[PDB]
Amino acid sequence: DSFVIRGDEVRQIAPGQTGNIADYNYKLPDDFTGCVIAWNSNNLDSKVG
């Protein structure tokens, strides 16, 4: 599963989490078996203006 998110909200991408993204955008199971992999992408995913 793949998406772009602000660095502060990456903490919400885990089992049992709460807040805007975990609540309203991407919800993991309580019993998640898996990996959550992330990197800062500022050189590609930011733009002038």
Binding site: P15, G16, T18, D30
Partner: protein, 49 residues
């Protein structure tokens, strides 16, 4: 005093039930003795533990 044998058999069963009930109030190292109290304060994964 002759009936001390029968009264002791009533007292032991009463004392065992009193002790079994009083142990509902003990923390066992948990944050609280009441399930709704634990569930209200905590993250589900901490509350489970």
């Amino acid at each position: 005093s002759a009936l001390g044998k029968l009264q002791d058999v009533v007292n032991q069963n009463a004392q065992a039930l009193n002790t079994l009930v009083k142990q509902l109030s003990s923390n066992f190292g948990a944050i609280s003795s009441v399930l709704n109290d634990i569930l209200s304060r905590l993250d589900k994964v901490e509350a489970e533990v």
